[PDB]
Design a protein around this ligand. Structure first.
Ligand SMILES: [K+]
Ligand SMILES: [K+]
Ligand SMILES: [K+]
Ligand SMILES: [K+]
Ligand SMILES: [K+]
Ligand SMILES: [K+]
Ligand SMILES: [K+]
Ligand SMILES: [Mg+2]
Ligand SMILES: [Mg+2]
Ligand SMILES: [Mg+2]
Ligand SMILES: [Mg+2]
Ligand SMILES: [Mg+2]
Ligand SMILES: [Mg+2]
Ligand SMILES: [Mg+2]
Ligand SMILES: [Mg+2]
Ligand SMILES: [Mg+2]
Ligand SMILES: [Mg+2]
Ligand SMILES: [Mg+2]
Ligand SMILES: [Mg+2]
Ligand SMILES: [Mg+2]
Ligand SMILES: [Mg+2]
Ligand SMILES: [Mg+2]
Ligand SMILES: [Mg+2]
Ligand SMILES: [Mg+2]
Ligand SMILES: [Mg+2]
Ligand SMILES: [Mg+2]
Ligand SMILES: [Mg+2]
Ligand SMILES: [Mg+2]
Ligand SMILES: [Mg+2]
Ligand SMILES: [Mg+2]
Ligand SMILES: [Mg+2]
Ligand SMILES: [Mg+2]
Ligand SMILES: [Mg+2]
Ligand SMILES: [Mg+2]
Ligand SMILES: [Mg+2]
Ligand SMILES: [Mg+2]
Ligand SMILES: [Mg+2]
Ligand SMILES: [Mg+2]
Ligand SMILES: [Mg+2]
Ligand SMILES: [Mg+2]
Ligand SMILES: [Mg+2]
Ligand SMILES: [Mg+2]
Ligand SMILES: [Mg+2]
Lengths: 333, 68, 124
RNA sequence: CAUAGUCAAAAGAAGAGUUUGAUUCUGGCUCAGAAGGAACGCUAGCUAUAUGCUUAACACAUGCAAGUCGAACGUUGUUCU
RNA sequence: GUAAGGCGUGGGAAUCUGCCGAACAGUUCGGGCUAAAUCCCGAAGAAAGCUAGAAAGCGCUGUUUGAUGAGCCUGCGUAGUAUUAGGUAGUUGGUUAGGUAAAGGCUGACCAAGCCGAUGAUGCUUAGCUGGUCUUUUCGGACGAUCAGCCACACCGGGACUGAGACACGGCCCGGACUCCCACGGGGGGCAGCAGUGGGGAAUCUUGGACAAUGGGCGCAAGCCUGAUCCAGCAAUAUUGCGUGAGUGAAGAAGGGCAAUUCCGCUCGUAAAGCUCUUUCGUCGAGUGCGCGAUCAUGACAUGACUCGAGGAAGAAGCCCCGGCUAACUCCGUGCCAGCAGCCGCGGUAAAACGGGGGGGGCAAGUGUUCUUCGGAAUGACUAGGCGUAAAGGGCACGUAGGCGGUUCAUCGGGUUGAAAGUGAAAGUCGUCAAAAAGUGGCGGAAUGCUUUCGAAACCACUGAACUUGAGUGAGACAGAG
């Protein structure tokens, strides 16, 4: 059924729990994907047939096994930008984006079975387009199970994403034995409160803050910091040269000024350091166009989606073969 | 052509007392005569409306002629 | 040509002969077999291709190919005829449709079997 | 003031195989797209809206598809008081 | 059937117009149909009366009008074919009579010799036309089926009558073919209305329900008719629709396939089963109905829908393909056989190409095959191609039509151009919103055009006066197997 699609796409496109055997298969599949990417220089069919078919397959998997090629061919447009922006306003897609449910098939089952409301009326149309001003809610007898499942999704999300890979990179079997003790703490509201107010997650937060700060240097952030503060960074060197001229022509001051200037030069001139450890993939929140109150839960659409904020795991260079977007301006172009 | 002309010069009318004004007689023959008289009155009112509309169209035509 | 020449004498179309004139712009035509025989292919191919001489309902005489392995056709058997030539055999421009009228389907065929009139085998 | 004001009327431009020992050109054949009042094979759960003798303007069983007015007019004959 | 007596578009004069709206005047008297009349005839001036049950309400007649239709005419636009070059003889025109509601060779008579045609008449073949449908970077091509507008036809030919209107699908007369009765003398019929049947064909539906809605006829109404319509039935024929579950699950079960027989040996495969959740669609059981279509009232659809309840993943996945073009590979069988094939090509003992197993890819209630159209095809080239050697410069000229072609100044307003008015039906295409959830509508835009009025005056055409650079002459010198 669905794990076999990883063999077709040479990566983890399946989103269920992998066995030991499936991880051993994925190692070989990712080796194949690495050897194919090196081989691209000598492939005549790489751009027009291979990458485009793989991207279309990934997009079809992403939107819950929809016929993406067929529906896009229904329109006469070459680029996928208006087609994908229109797909983001669907009712099942939005119910996935709000994190009220886990997968697109869950959302389709809930909408089809007459259990989600739009503007307090029951709407059972899975492909319905929501424009700005629409209010989304659940049924009164249905909303308590939805609230429980939303809490479970978020707290097992932090425990299963933000705790396994962030500084607790444990082997599989012993982390699986360790997860029972972590699941017992989430059994109570007091345990969730105390996990939230803990120095463990505070250290994890501080390390992730520093890690996000380091990744900004790939854009030359520290050079912009130096360009903002060029005059006073120079004034430090003027002060050092003035002191080392005046108080020397006839030593803690010299050591202090040297330490400060070397610290500043190191902080402003050190290149970006991309470490071996893989970046943790974070859950996105659709706050540019969807306003959510997770207590009931309810939501209101107030804006349109963005072509650069669709949470697909496809690279930009591959997806540009379908979108043809001038990226970098922030617009839906 | 504009909102103000329509909002000021529209005849908004009261409730019509003709609706529900039938009183059931004790003789079906008299009831048939009464319904026949109602039809005749409707014909007279329609003819008066036709005359009013004829005069309105004539005045508009005269104004357009003098403007042209 | 000049524009004046095109005004006087326009542009004609390309002239291409009809491929299946005997079908008379119909998708299929019923026929009756006159002679069932074999024919050898044009070289470099070599076989014994099973054909049938068919008189159509519009009184056209054609040669039609019998596809698949084995058939039950005889003289005076009703066959439904569709277009499509056989490249080995010049003068054979049509096909017999398997599983309709007298030409039976091929049981035991398993792959591509709607082109041979074969039903889906029921699972037991 | 305001049931005002906003100036929209498109989108749509793709190539491949096949003549030669190889090449470029000329030039056809074939293929990938969309579609139909379609037909046939295999296979089929549902709702809705469309469409459904393209051939013989061939021959037609049967029932129905144009009547209404007694407020135009006599006529005869039914009942009952 | 019809190639222009049609159609599209815009105009015109020499006409008529029931019902409908609005004025005015009348509605009198005799006779006839076995009996009468709003039937027929006569007199004036044309007529017609009914109702005190419909008594100042209908109806009729005459005259002026509006409105709607109809007849007639006309400019422009609208197939192929020259291996069809002449066609016409009431033909083309004139005069005078007749006919028509009305112009008119519409036609009798007389007179003239015209009229049409290489800007394609006439002949032959095919064809209803339009709005539009499909396709397409604009253009074009194919089509003209549904629906709407116009026309033509109603078994095949020919006629007229009645009528406001017909030369009349379910009217009449005549002739013909076919057919059904006949008591044998003679009569009757016309589904290309809706259903339906034979037949032909690859192929195309029920001998259904109701006049509830909308439209139409008659009636003062009450109503009555209405196979118009509305609504059900059959058919994957079409449609960017929905569903066939959502999670979890390792004994990685059994079984199937492959394997130096590599890593649970690899794979079918988290796939199944099992376990938990939800029951859309369909199924079953009920309940309200001025929910709604319809209102003063009337509901065929409706055994529907809506609302509630029962139940259990239960009832719902195929078809084509896997040598290249073109996404997807192994085993067995066969051995130039059997077979495959859109093209190139495969098969002669290790076939990824034939046929089966196993696996996989694309689409998906469809998917292939055939037919047909456009595209790719710049492969009839306006957009947008060519002709030395590849298809293609006429052997070479002269000239008809046609096409194309210098300057200035002045005039003009046909083309051109600007604005206004009329028209360009609705539906469809495009924009937008709302509605709806496979369904609808409003407002726009577009409809590139034609007619009228009034501006402009550069260009094209036309008119006038001029110019000399292109063409042609003269005078004087020449050359030449013209
Ligand atoms: K075959
Ligand atoms: K018309
Ligand atoms: K006829
Ligand atoms: K009715
Ligand atoms: K089919
Ligand atoms: K099931
Ligand atoms: K000349
Ligand atoms: Mg050659
Ligand atoms: Mg028809
Ligand atoms: Mg009568
Ligand atoms: Mg001709
Ligand atoms: Mg015809
Ligand atoms: Mg035509
Ligand atoms: Mg007939
Ligand atoms: Mg009449
Ligand atoms: Mg008459
Ligand atoms: Mg009839
Ligand atoms: Mg019929
Ligand atoms: Mg038959
Ligand atoms: Mg009615
Ligand atoms: Mg009436
Ligand atoms: Mg009916
Ligand atoms: Mg569909
Ligand atoms: Mg249900
Ligand atoms: Mg029920
Ligand atoms: Mg009702
Ligand atoms: Mg029904
Ligand atoms: Mg491939
Ligand atoms: Mg072998
Ligand atoms: Mg193949
Ligand atoms: Mg094979
Ligand atoms: Mg072309
Ligand atoms: Mg083109
Ligand atoms: Mg050209
Ligand atoms: Mg060329
Ligand atoms: Mg040339
Ligand atoms: Mg020459
Ligand atoms: Mg030559
Ligand atoms: Mg001038
Ligand atoms: Mg002019
Ligand atoms: Mg229109
Ligand atoms: Mg519409
Ligand atoms: Mg619209």
């Amino acid at each position: 059924l669905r794990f076999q699609t990883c063999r077709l796409l040479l990566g983890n496109v399946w989103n269920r729990e992998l066995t030991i055997i499936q991880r051993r298969i994925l190692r070989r599949l990712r080796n194949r994907k690495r050897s194919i990417k090196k081989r691209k220089i000598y492939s005549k069919k790489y751009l027009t047939s291979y990458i485009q078919l793989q991207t279309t397959r990934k997009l079809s998997l992403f939107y819950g096994d929809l016929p993406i090629t067929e529906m896009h061919r229904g329109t006469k447009r070459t680029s996928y930008i208006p087609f994908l922006l229109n797909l983001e306003t669907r009712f099942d897609v939005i119910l996935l984006r709000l994190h009220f449910l886990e997968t697109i098939p869950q959302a389709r089952q809930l909408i089809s079975h007459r259990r989600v409301c739009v503007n307090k009326g029951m709407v059972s149309i899975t492909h319905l387009k929501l424009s700005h001003g629409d209010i989304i809610s659940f049924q009164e007898n249905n909303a308590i199970i939805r609230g429980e499942e939303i809490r479970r999704s978020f707290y097992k999300e932090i425990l299963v994403e933000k705790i396994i890979g962030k500084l607790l990179h444990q082997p599989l079997r012993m982390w699986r034995r360790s997860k029972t003790e972590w699941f017992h703490l989430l059994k109570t509201k007091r345990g969730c409160r105390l996990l939230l107010k803990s120095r463990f997650l505070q250290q994890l937060r501080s390390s992730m803050q520093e890690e996000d700060l380091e990744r900004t240097k790939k854009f030359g952030s520290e050079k912009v910091c130096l360009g903002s503060s060029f005059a006073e960074h120079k004034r430090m060197k003027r002060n050092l040269l003035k002191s080392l001229f005046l108080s020397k022509r006839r030593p803690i001051v010299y050591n202090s000024s040297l330490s400060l200037y070397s610290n500043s030069t190191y902080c402003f001139a050190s290149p970006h350091k991309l470490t071996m450890k893989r970046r943790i993939k974070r859950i996105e929140l659709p706050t540019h166009y969807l306003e959510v109150n997770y207590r009931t839960p309810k939501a209101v659409v107030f804006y349109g989606p963005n072509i650069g904020h669709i949470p697909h795991d496809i690279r930009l260079k591959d997806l540009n073969l379908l979108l043809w977007s001038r990226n970098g301006r922030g617009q839906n172009i | 052509t504009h909102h103000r002309h329509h909002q000021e010069t529209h005849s908004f009318l009261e409730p019509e007392s003709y609706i529900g004004s039938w009183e059931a007689p004790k003789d079906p023959k008299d009831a048939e005569r009464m319904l026949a008289q109602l039809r005749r009155d409707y014909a007279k009112k329609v003819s008066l409306y036709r005359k009013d509309y004829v005069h309105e169209i004539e005045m508009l035509r005269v104004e357009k002629q003098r403007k042209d | 040509p000049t524009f004046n020449q095109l005004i006087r004498h326009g542009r004609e179309e390309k002239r291409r002969t009809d491929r299946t004139r005997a079908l008379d712009k119909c998708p299929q035509k019923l026929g009756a077999c006159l002679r069932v025989s074999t024919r050898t292919p044009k070289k470099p191919n070599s076989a014994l291709r099973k054909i049938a001489k068919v008189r159509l309902s519009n009184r056209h005489d054609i040669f039609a190919y019998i596809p698949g392995e084995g058939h039950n056709l005889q003289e005076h058997s009703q066959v439904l005829i569709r277009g499509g030539r056989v490249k080995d055999l010049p003068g054979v421009k049509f096909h017999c449709i398997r599983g309709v009228k007298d030409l039976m389907g091929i049981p035991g065929r398993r792959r591509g079997r709607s082109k041979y009139g074969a039903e889906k085998p029921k699972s037991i």
